[PDB]
């Protein structure tokens, strides 16, 4: 029955049907890849990033498509088109009660009036599924590991390897596709939680938000993956100083705030070495990039 299936969307666009209870690999579907100065896109939520180092755009790809044609404070123009597809799938054989899977294909073409011929493209495909105690589904960032722990208690039930990473878990509920929540973890983090505690208890040990940068056959792609203390983060651009002084705790943490594309001031550091510009595009986990201070102007 469709109700017992758990469709899993991976990076390369495949749709792997699994049993919810056991996780055994049923039929799989073959489709176009989910996603295709430079622009790096999150293939899970459609967020866009500016490759100053790396930053995050305040608009995801569907927003840019709906607002196209538009331009930002930097001067980059954005064009967008959207196109749907409605292939019908048999729940048993997985060929193209029946399954109604709708896919929206988003394309954003970015051209800058400064550089006349240089331009960039991007693609992002979203399944037409509404967003529907402990998190039941966990997906590894680098590998295609999928974990299913009990929402009632937090004990693992079945693990499955699918190859390329998992960017969405969907179920057939009422009579349509519905997107189940999932969390992205580093494989080392999942292993550490399994061996040390034995029961995953992610709310629905320090877990730190990092922006994993991965590379595949379609280009560079980012993903927001949690890590534990022990996962080697790629070194940041700046190592400030090995200062030795008394420690103070009488401060208050403050929100990050947006950041400007081009700096307005220089900087002088106290006897401290500055390194390469943060070396993004390295396979690994980076600190969360700052969101870029910008607006939009529909043309």
């Amino acid at each position: 029955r469709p109700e017992n299936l758990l469709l899993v969307s991976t990076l390369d666009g495949s749709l792997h049907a699994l049993s919810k209870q056991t996780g055994d690999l049923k039929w799989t579907l073959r489709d176009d890849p989910v996603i295709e100065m430079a622009f790096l896109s999150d293939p899970a939520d459609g967020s866009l990033y500016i490759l100053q180092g790396l930053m995050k755009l305040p608009f995801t790809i569907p927003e840019l498509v709906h607002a196209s044609p538009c331009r930002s404070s930097d001067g980059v123009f954005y064009t967008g088109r959207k196109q749907d597809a409605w292939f019908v799938v048999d729940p048993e054989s997985g060929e193209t009660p029946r399954l109604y899977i709708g896919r929206t294909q988003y394309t954003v073409t970015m051209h800058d009036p400064r550089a006349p011929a240089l331009r960039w493209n991007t693609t992002y495909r979203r399944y037409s599924a509404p967003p529907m105690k402990y998190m039941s589904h966990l997906a590894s960032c680098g590998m295609g590991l999928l974990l299913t722990v009990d929402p009632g208690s937090g004990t693992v039930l079945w693990t499955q390897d699918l190859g390329v990473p998992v960017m969405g878990v969907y179920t057939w509920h009422q009579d349509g596709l519905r997107q189940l929540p999932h969390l992205t973890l580093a494989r080392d983090t999942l292993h550490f939680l399994a061996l040390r505690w034995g029961h995953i208890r992610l709310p629905a040990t320090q877990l730190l938000m990092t922006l994993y940068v991965g590379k595949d056959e379609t280009g560079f792609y980012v993903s927001k993956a949690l890590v534990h203390t022990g996962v080697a983060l790629v070194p940041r651009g700046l190592t400030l100083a090995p200062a030795d002084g008394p420690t103070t705790d009488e401060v208050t943490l403050q929100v990050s705030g947006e950041r400007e594309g081009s700096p307005s001031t220089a900087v002088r550091y106290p006897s401290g070495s500055v390194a390469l510009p943060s070396q993004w595009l390295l396979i690994g986990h980076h600190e969360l990039p700052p969101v870029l201070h910008t607006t939009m102007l529909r043309v």
Binding site: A243, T247, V251, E258, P263, S264
Partner: protein, 131 residues
């Protein structure tokens, strides 16, 4: 009712925005002092009290371009080792951030306590020595 000083000193001239502050610092050749603070932070409140009730700091503050912000600035160079409050940073009129002017603590390079007023005075005098 709503004041630019926010309680850090009322007889002083404060700048509203970072860009106008940089323009003033470049034109008038006065170093820019930036105070990051929050109204819900008791540490910021105590430092505000000490800063406002210090004769020497108020006297020396007129030789600067002053700016206090409750929200993080758009400049990346103003938070070299984190975004926390209270945090006092200095900018040279050369539009060069004086990240070498630091406080007394190692984890928070630019955090001042309600006892480091002599250190704040020394750092302000050091900032007055233009590059």
């Amino acid at each position: 009712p709503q004041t630019l000083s926010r309680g850090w000193g009322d007889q002083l001239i404060w700048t509203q925005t970072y860009e106008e502050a940089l323009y003033k610092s470049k034109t008038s050749n006065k170093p820019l002092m930036i105070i990051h603070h929050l109204d819900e932070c008791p540490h910021s409140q105590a430092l505000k009290k000490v800063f406002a009730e210090n004769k020497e700091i108020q006297k020396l503050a007129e030789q600067f371009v002053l700016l206090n912000l409750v929200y993080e600035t758009t400049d990346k160079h103003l938070s070299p080792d984190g975004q926390y409050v209270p945090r006092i940073m200095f900018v040279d009129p050369s539009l060069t951030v004086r990240a070498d002017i630091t406080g007394r603590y190692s984890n928070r390079l630019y955090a001042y306590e309600p006892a480091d007023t002599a250190l704040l005075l020394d750092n302000m005098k050091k900032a007055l020595k233009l590059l």
